[PDB]
Amino acid sequence: VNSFSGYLKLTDNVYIKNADIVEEAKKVKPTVVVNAANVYLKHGGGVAGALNKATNNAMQVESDDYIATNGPLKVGGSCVLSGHNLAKHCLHVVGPNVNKGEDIQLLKSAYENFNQHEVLLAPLLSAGIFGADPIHSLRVCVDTVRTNVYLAVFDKNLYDKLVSSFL
Numbered sequence: 732v733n734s735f736s737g738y739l740k741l742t743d744n745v746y747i748k749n750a751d752i753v754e755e756a757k758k759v760k761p762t763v764v765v766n767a768a769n770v771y772l773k774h775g776g777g778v779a780g781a782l783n784k785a786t787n788n789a790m791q792v793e794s795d796d797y798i799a800t801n802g803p804l805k806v807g808g809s810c811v812l813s814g815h816n817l818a819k820h821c822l823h824v825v826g827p828n829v830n831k832g833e834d835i836q837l838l839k840s841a842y843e844n845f846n847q848h849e850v851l852l853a854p855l856l857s858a859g860i861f862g863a864d865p866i867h868s869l870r871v872c873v874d875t876v877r878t879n880v881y882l883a884v885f886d887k888n889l890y891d892k893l894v895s896s897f898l
């Protein structure tokens with residue numbers, strides 16, 4: 732299905748919309764929804780907490796079972812788990828948190844995880860309280876992702892700065 736609408740195409744493979752990723756996931760029910768995860772898959776705030784709350788904590792129960800069996804992910808790494816009622820699959824991706832001293836080179840590695848899936852609904856990796864320059868995160872996305880990615884950015888002011896810089 733992947734019925735994305737209202738998206739502005741920036742490149743042959745990158746689209747963007749001023750929207751809440753949770754609301755987009757409920758409407759579209761995409762094949763893959765990307766979560767802006769941490770290495771222990773603990774979804775307490777921001778995007779991760781919003782996606783987990785939309786699943787009524789089912790994402791957290793499943794995440795805890797994955798960590799118990801496989802251990803933590805690494806910064807720049809990912810894992811595929813159920814999307815529950817939001818998507819067929821959830822691709823949990825760990826972008827570097829520069830506000831806590833993690834290296835920005837790892838942002839490229841985090842975006843490279845998107846390439847194993849044909850179509851993804853995703854947030855701007857490492858933006859918000861993760862501390863990275865959001866326009867720089869968009870540049871890395873454009874230069875790294877080669878499959879089709881629909882970026883949901885829930886802030887019209889940020890969306891307008893991204894569309895203006897990209898033009």
Ligand SMILES: CC(=O)N1CCN(Cc2cccc(-c3cc4c(N[C@H](c5ccc6c(c5)S(=O)(=O)CCC6)C(C)C)ncnc4[nH]3)c2)CC1
Binds near residue numbers: 754854855856857889
């Ligand atoms: C109608 C109603 O009451 N609502 C509204 C609330 N809605 C649920 C709801 C509640 C709370 C938050 C969010 C939401 C935040 C968010 C989003 N934020 C962006 C962003 C990008 C990357 C990262 C972060 C943030 S972070 O979380 O700071 C750190 C990780 C990396 C910023 C605009 C830069 N981008 C996309 N979708 C979103 N969703 C949503 C349920 C439905």
